[PDB]
A and B are shown apart, each in its own frame.
With several copies, the nearest count.
Chain A
Amino acid sequence: VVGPQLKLHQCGLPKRMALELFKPFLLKKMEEKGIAPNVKAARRMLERQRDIKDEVWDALEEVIHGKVVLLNRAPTLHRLGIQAFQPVLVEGQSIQLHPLVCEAFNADFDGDQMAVHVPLSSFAQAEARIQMLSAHNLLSPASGEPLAKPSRDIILGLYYITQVRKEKKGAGLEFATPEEALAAHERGEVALNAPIKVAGRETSVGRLKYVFANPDEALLAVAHGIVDLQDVVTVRYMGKRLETSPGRILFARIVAEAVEDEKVAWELIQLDVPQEKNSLKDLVYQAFLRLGMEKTARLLDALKYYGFTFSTTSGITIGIDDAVIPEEKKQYLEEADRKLLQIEQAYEMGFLTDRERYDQILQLWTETTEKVTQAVFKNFEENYPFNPLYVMAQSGARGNPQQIRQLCGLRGLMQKPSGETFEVPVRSSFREGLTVLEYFISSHGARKGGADTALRTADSGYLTRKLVDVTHE
């Protein structure tokens, strides 16, 4: 079970389990204390649940101090499939794992059960927490790329905060040159025309109305409800009159704070865009090479934190009115629709071969499909920059282009059992009723996909086996 506050360094394990596991080490510690006279004593003392004085918990909790344990996942695919952490005894049945390493082990929380072993020899423990601990193995053995990076939620958070909005651009506000363009367009904003974030090259009135001297100054106004974190404002940082959003300004600090080397915090961060999974990933890599290993660790949780926090306030959820359908759908549909009729007339005559007809039809759809896809995003990118669903996808957060397509636009070509994709596409989106047959049609390719995973889930080491039999030495 996810352990939000937990630190990379550690992991939460049930004291109950701890008792059993570290029983021997516990027994002797008991003798060490007044808890028990001897071993055999300490043992019987623990033979029954109800017969344990609370002093023993303080005994286990003391033995464990310092030492660390190992955790395993269902398929142990790479070395990180096992990591070391310092236990933090906890009540309950469930084990509390850190979310960042939830990437290394392919683990969700729909019930996946992990295992745990104990390194005994002072030596085993030595190697275990030195070269096998979790916070010391950040980078992946596959790609130099970071393995422990802001995963799903954290991003979403860190993203929402660092972003800029834009609104209605009625009057031609290109203030960039006139002084009457400052006065009039500043009043018009106060009016109901020019917004706080309008297309006005040099500066939208939003930047005109507010000028913050010191950093802190910026955030206070926000706090007081004068400025949203995502709005465009001007601030005076170290020798620069930078025109960036509050949110961005803040982000700069979170990092500038995770590592007190502030200037070094600005050199490796790009506050000129919304924080994406890549942006962050990069941030992490830079932080590593540049500063230091353990320091990088700090910044990691630091991000993990604010990410989560901001996420909850951001108030992004998923209602039906979020999966917006583009108006061009019906168009792109009908257009390609009649064109389908053309292909038909062209066949009814005897021009195209039975096969030509087919391949030509699928073609059309394959195109039309890819068409709506870019259409729906264009809708979001243009009208709803902050649509729930869309934000999760663009940001490293969650959501695949194809997936989205299935919701707003439409899932179009499912293949038959064999492979020969159907001639007819699936006109509907998940937003509306994916009809009976349409559904059944989809069900076909569903099985083959599952039939593919099953035949693989069987033996996971097959490939890796061959490779270890010829590479271990």
Chain B
Amino acid sequence: MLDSKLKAPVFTVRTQGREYGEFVLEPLERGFGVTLGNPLRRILLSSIPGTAVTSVYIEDVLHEFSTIPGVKEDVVEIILNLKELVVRFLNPSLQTVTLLLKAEGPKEVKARDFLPVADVEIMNPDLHIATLEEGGRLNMEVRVDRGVGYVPAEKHGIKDRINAIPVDAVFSPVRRVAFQVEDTRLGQRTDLDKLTLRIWTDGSVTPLEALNQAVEILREHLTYFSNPQ
């Protein structure tokens, strides 16, 4: 092709790591960059499946409002940092993975201290979880699932071990979406939308990935305009 069609969007990309991901695409007809960036943004913040802590079990702790000796942090401040942790499985076979951890003595248990698990990777190694002092026992099991959106610990109420405690599920791997529609000058006319959205991600998935998934959800949805009635 050479004219109208060859003048197709030049989807260029610039991505560092698995977090930030810029996306540019132009030219575009009058006010389309908006018509696109917006829905996609809505999707990228709600639809996209992710992963996050859904249940925790501590050695001698029975409820979330307790305190563990030798451990500055309190159970609640810890289950909180866990929500911050970002994991990443590589295939469907992993619906629910339970990462194990057990540390003692003067040590700053970070997320890198979890025993490795085959198909699972941890994007949050140095993440702080607690500061143990002398005689500080800390043996725990933190469940991890693949879901979508926000699920209050009250809503699911996971049941691994009777003494375990449920945590709020934050699935959207996307941290924040953003899109700009700056005019672009191309020979003929000037009124040309130049969409370019910036995506942030916890690490679980990647910008590019997220975007792909997003656009699909849409496409698939557009398909629902098939059988009239």
Contacts and interface: CB of A to CB of B under 8 A. Distances in A.
Query: In their complex, do chains A and B touch, with some C-beta pair under 8 Å?
Result: yes
Nearest to B176: A216
Given A209-B154, A211-B76, A236-B80, A217 B65 contact: no
Q: How large is the interface on B (under 10, 10 to 19, 20 to 34, 35 or more residues)?
A: 20 to 34
Interface string B182-209: 1100001010000000001000000000
Contacts of A48: none
A211 B150 contact: no
A220 interface: yes
Contacts of B100: none
Contacts of B83: 213-214, 217
B51 to A, nearest CB: 15
The winner among B150, B188, B190 for most chain A CB atoms within 10 A is: B150
Given A179-B65, A216-B175, A217-B170, A224 B190 contact: no
Contacts of B77: 236
15 contacts: A5-B182, A179-B65, A209-B154, A212-B80, A213-B80, A213-B83, A216-B175, A216-B176, A217-B83, A217-B170, A220-B176, A223-B150, A224-B150, A226-B150, A236-B80
B84 to A, nearest CB: 5
Given A54-B188, A179-B65, A220 B45 contact: yes
B81 interface: yes
Dominant SS among interface residues on chain B: mixed
Interface string B139-155: 00000000001101010
A182 B80 contact: no
Contact of B65 (A54, A182, A223): A182
Contacts of A5: 182-183
A31 interface: no
Interface in A217-251: 217, 219-221, 223-224, 226, 236
A432 interface: no
Contact of B84 (A209, A214, A223, A224): A214
A231 to B, nearest CB: 14
A224 B80 contact: no
A334 interface: no
B47 interface: no
Contacts of B76: 211
A91 interface: yes
Contacts of A182: 65
Contact of A220 (B80, B150, B190): B150
Interface in A190-215: 190, 209-214
Given A5-B182, A179-B65, A220-B176, 5 more contacts: A209-B154, A213-B81, A216-B200, A217-B83, A220-B175
Interface of B: 45-46, 65, 76-77, 80-81, 83-84, 149-150, 152, 154, 168, 170, 172, 175-176, 182-183, 188, 190, 200
Contacts of A221: 150, 152, 168
Contacts of A190: 154
B172 A220 contact: yes
Nearest to A209: B154
Contacts of A220: 45, 150, 170, 172, 175-176
A224 B183 contact: no
Nearest to A90: B190
Contacts of B154: 190, 209
Given A211-B76, A213-B83, A226-B152, A219 B176 contact: yes
A224 B149 contact: yes
Contacts of B190: 90-91
Interface string A47-90: 00000001000000000000000000000000000000000001
Contacts of A212: 80
Nearest to A305: B180
Contacts of A54: 188
Interface in A88-103: 90-91
Contacts of B150: 220-221, 223-224, 226
Nearest to B190: A91
Contacts of B188: 54
B80 A211 contact: yes
Contacts of A213: 80-81, 83-84
Return the 6 tightest CB-CB contacts between A and B, nearest first: A224-B150, A213-B80, A216-B175, A213-B83, A213-B84, A216-B176
Contacts of B46: 224
**Residue among B46, B81, B152, B172 with most chain A CB within 10 A:** B152
Nearest to B76: A211
Q: Which has the most chain A C-beta neighbours within 10 Å: B154, B183, B200?
A: B154
B104 to A, nearest CB: 25
For A182, A190, A214, which residue has the most chain B Cβ atoms within 10 angstroms? A214
Nearest to B185: A61
B4 to A, nearest CB: 18
Interface in A2-16: 5
